[PDB]
Amino acid sequence: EIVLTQSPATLSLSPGERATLSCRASSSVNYMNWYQQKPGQAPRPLIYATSNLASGIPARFSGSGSGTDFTLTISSLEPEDFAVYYCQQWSSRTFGGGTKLEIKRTVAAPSVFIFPPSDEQLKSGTASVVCLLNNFYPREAKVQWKVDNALQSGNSQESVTEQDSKDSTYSLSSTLTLSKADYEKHKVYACEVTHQGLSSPVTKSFNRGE
Amino acid sequence: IVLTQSPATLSLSPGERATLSCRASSSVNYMNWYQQKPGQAPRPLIYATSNLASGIPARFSGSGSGTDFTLTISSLEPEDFAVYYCQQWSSRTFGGGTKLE
Amino acid sequence: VQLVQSGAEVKKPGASVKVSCKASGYTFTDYNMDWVRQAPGQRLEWMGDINPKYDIIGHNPKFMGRVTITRDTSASTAYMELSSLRSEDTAVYYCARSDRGWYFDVWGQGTLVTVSSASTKGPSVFPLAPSSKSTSGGTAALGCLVKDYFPEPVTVSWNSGALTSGVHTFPAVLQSSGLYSLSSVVTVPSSSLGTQTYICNVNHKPSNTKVDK
Amino acid sequence: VQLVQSGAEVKKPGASVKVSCKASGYTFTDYNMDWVRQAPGQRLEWMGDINPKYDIIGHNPKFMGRVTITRDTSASTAYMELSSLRSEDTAVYYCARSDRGWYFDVWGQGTLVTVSS
Amino acid sequence: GLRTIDGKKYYFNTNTAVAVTGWQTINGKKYYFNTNTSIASTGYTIISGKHFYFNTDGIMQIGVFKGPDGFEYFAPANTDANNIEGQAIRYQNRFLYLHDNIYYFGNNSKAATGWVTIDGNRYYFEPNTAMGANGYKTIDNKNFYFRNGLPQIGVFKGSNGFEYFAPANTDANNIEGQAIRYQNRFLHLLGKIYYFGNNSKAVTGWQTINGKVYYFMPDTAMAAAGGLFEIDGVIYFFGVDGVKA
Q1: Where, in this chain's numbering, is alpha-D-galactosyl-(1->3)-beta-D-galactosyl-(1->4)-N-acetyl-beta-D-glucosamine 2 bound (chain E)?
Q2: C105 touches chain A (CB under 8 A)
Q3: Is the CB of residue A120 less than 8 Å from the CB of residue A30?
Q4: Calpha distance C80→C50 (Å, rounded)
C-alpha cells in the first residue's frame, strides 16, 4: 500500500537560501526518516522519526510533518548540502524516489566541439563520432545527429557529467556509432545543438575525411 | 472403471430425434462426447457435461448424472452422420460409441 | 563503529552471489542488519533484515524466492545470498544497521554485483583529435575514448596525475552489446604539438589492463 | 490453431516409429499433449500425455514398456515412440490438447501406422 | 517466589511480605503482574497502550500471536520505534521467518488468514497459527500438500494414502498443486514411476499390474527400477520401467 512520493523531482536554488523538501505518503503514517546521498557515496542518515536528527547533522536541517505530508527543510544552504534527499517509512521500509537539490546559477551557453574517429579504430571495422557540449547550464539540451543532413534519431547514446563544483555547469557527450559498413559512403557529419542559452541552433561539421 | 452405451449402430433419416447414452459402472462426475466423420480425426462436442464448444449447434443438449449419461440431438441433418464416442476425463477411458447410417 | 562489506563480485544470469558485512566497534548482537540495494540511479530498494540474537529474518516479497540472509555472531558478519540472478539484478548492495528501530545509523560502503552474459574484457583507448581555437574563443579541448570494456569501473587521469583543471570524465553508458563505453576529456589553451604533451591514463582493474594513450 | 502430425509410416514388426506433432498458433507450454490409438473398427484407447514440466505420464499398462514420449520446446514440437512393435498395434495415432484439463481442444490429422510382413 | 493460587500466579517474593506488582524478572524470564490485582497477566494483555502476549504461565514470549484484531508481531526490543521485548510493532507488507516458519503481514501489520496471493504466487497460511502451512491439509474439500505455505507438486502421502498433487489445468481446471482424480494409469515424475488405482491413490508394496510384477516403496510409493533391490532379505532385479526379472 504505502507509496512515498518526492514532491519536487529537482530543486534548483542558491547557497544561503532556504530550501524545502516534501515527501507525501499515500496513507497516514506515524514517522518519516530522511536520508542523503552524494554521487558515488552511500546514503547518509539525515533525520529520523520526524523531527529528531542524527549526529554530524548541523542545526540547519529541520524536520516536521504529520499524517500524509512531511517536509524536510534547510534554514540556509551551504555549498555542501546540494545532493539527493530520500525519505523513508520504517514499518514498510519503502523509500522515496529522491529529490535532487542542485545549485542554481545563471544561464550558460555551451561550447560545442566535434571529434572525428581515430585511425586504429577505422581499420578495425568501426567508426565512432563524438559530439561534446562543454560547460553549459541548465542541464536540458537536445542533440540532433545528421549524416549528410539525414537526421538519425536511433543511432546514438549520450552521457552527462555531474554539476561542476567550481562553476556549477554540466557537460554532455553524444556519440554516434555505426559499423565501418554504412560509414564511408557518406560525407558530411554534423551535430546540431539546441539549448536555452543559444539564440539559434549551433551546428558543428565534419568532412568526408582528410 | 468401464462405461457402456445403449445404442451401438443406428439408422435414421434426417429430421428425426436422436438419443444415445453412456453408463459408467461407477459414480463419475463429468463426461465428454466426440464426433468423428469417416476418414478424418475425431471432433469434440460436449465437455464437462452440460457444455459445448468448437462450433456446435445449440440443438446438442448433453445431460447426465451419476452412472447414466445421455446426449441429445433435437434435429438430425444430412452432413451430421458420424460416430459418437463418449469419454471419461479422469480415468481417461473412452467407449464403443454409436454410428449413423 | 563501521561496517565493511565484500568486494565487487560479477556473475552471469542464473548464478548466485555472496555479500558479507563486517560489523565493527559495537556489540554485534545488540542491533539488526538491513540489506538495501540500489539499481543504477534508481530509488533505494529494501531487501531484508536479520536479528543476530534470535535468528529472525524478514524478506521483501519481491525477492521471496531467492534471497537468504544469514548470521555469524562470533565473526560479527552479515550475509545475503541472491540466487537465480536476473540481468536486472545489477545494483549496489548496501548493509545498514538499525538504531532502536528508527533509521540506519551506519552504512557499508556498498558491494557491486554485475549480472550480464558479457565476459570480462578490457577497453580500447582511442585519441580525440583537437584543433579549433579559430578566432573568438581561445580555449581548445581534447580527450580519450574508453570503449568496449566490462565490467565497471574504470578510472581515467591526465598526464599521470598532473592535470585537474578542465578534466571531465563522463559516466559510462551501457551499450546494446553488453559492453560499457565512456569518454574522458580535458580543456586546454593554445598548446599544440611540441608543448605540454597530454597523456591519457586508463586503468581497468578487473581486466588487469593498463593503457596510457 | 492446429496440430500437424508426421507422415504415414509403415514398417515390420519388432521396430520403432517416432510420431511428431507440431503445434501451431498457441504457446506450446500452456497446455498438455495427449495420444490415443484407434485401430480399424475399434474403440478409442488412450496412451499418454506430456506436460511442460517434463513429466511423461499416463502410460496405458498395455503400453508401459513399449511407449516413449518426449518434448522439444525449442522447436514447439511433441513426439511419441513405440518399441517392441507388433502386428496388433496397427492403428491411427492422434495428438490432442487439454483445455484447463478438459476434453482436448484440437486433434491432429492422425498418423497412419500399420505393421505387417 | 511465586505460587499459584486458584489457577492464578502471584509473586510473593521471599520474606512472606504479601505482595508485589508490575514487571518482574523471575529466573531470566519476564512477567507482568496486574497493578490492581497482582495477578500474572495471561494471554493478550494491553499495558499502557502497548500490546503484549503471555502464555498460560504468565511468561512473556516473542512471536506472532492472535489478538482481538488479528495476529500481531510482538518483537525484540529494537525493531520498530524503540519498542520493548514482547511489544507488538508495526510490520507492513513484509515476510517474517520465525522458528523456521513463515509469516506475512499486510497493510495494517496483521498476519495472513488462510489463502492469500502475494506478488503472483498463492500462499496458504494456517488460520489456526497464522504461519505458512506445512504438510498435507484439506481446504474446502480440496486437498493440498504445503511446504512453507506454497502447494507443492508431486506424489506425496496423505490422510487417505498417496495423492498426486498436479499442476494447474491438469484435471478440471484444478488449482496449482491441488490433488486431482487419477485413475488406473501410471505416472512418471522426477524419474520415479508411480501407479494409481481407481481411488486415485498410488499403490504400495507388491502389486501385479498387467501380467507383470512391480514393487513400490512403502514410504514414497516410487516404483523400484534401474538395478538390484533388497526388499527385506531377498535380492531382486527390477528393469528400467519397474518390471522384476
Answers
A1: 171, 178-181, 198-201
A2: yes
A3: no
A4: 10
Q: Does the beta carbon of C213 lie under 8 angstroms from any beta carbon of chain A?
A: no
Backbone angles phi, psi at C161, to 5 degrees: 105, -5
For residue C70, list chain E residues with Cβ-Cβ distance below 8 A: none
Q: Indicate whether E159 and E242 sit together in one domain.
A: yes
The secondary structure of residue A122, as a DSSP letter, is H
Question: Which residue type is seen at C205?
Answer: K
Ligand-binding annotation for E92, yes or no, is: no
D85 with D114: CB under 8 angstroms? no
Cβ atoms within 10 Å, residue C207? 16
Answer whether B85 sits within 8 Å of D44, measured CB to CB. Answer: yes
Q: Which of E220, E198, E217 is nearest to E207 (CA)?
A: E217
Beta partners for residue E213, in sequence order: E208
- Sign of torsion, CA A136 A142 A146 A152? positive
Q: Count Cβ–Cβ pairs < 8 Å, chain B vs chain D.
A: 43
- Cα A166 to Cα A40, A98, C166, E170, E179, distances in angstroms: 19, 24, 10, 68, 70
CA distances from E37 to E2, E22, E32, E44, E49 (A): 15, 10, 11, 17, 19
Q: For cell 474446502, what's the residue?
A: E140
Q: In chain A, what are the domains?
A: 1-105 (2.60.40.10), 106-210 (2.60.40.10)
Cβ pair C161, C203 in contact under 8 A: no
Residue D36, beta-bridge partner list: D46, D94
Residues E90, A90: C-beta atoms closer than 8 Å: yes
Query: Do E163 and E232 belong together in one domain?
Result: yes
Separation CA A97–CA A23 (nearest Å): 9
Q: How far is it, in rounded angstroms, from Cα A131 to Cα C106?
A: 42
Those residues whose C-beta lies under 8 Å from the C-beta of residue B65, and which sit 6 or more positions away, are none
Solving technique: X-ray
Nearest CA-CA distance, residue B16 and chain D, Å? 26
Domain with CATH 2.60.40.10 in chain C: 114-213
Chain E CB within 8 Å of residue B40 CB: no
Residue A42 touches chain C, beta carbons under 8 Å: yes
What is the CATH code for C114-213?
2.60.40.10
Taking CA atoms, C178 is separated from A173, C115, C150, C206, E181, in Å, by 20, 10, 8, 16, 49
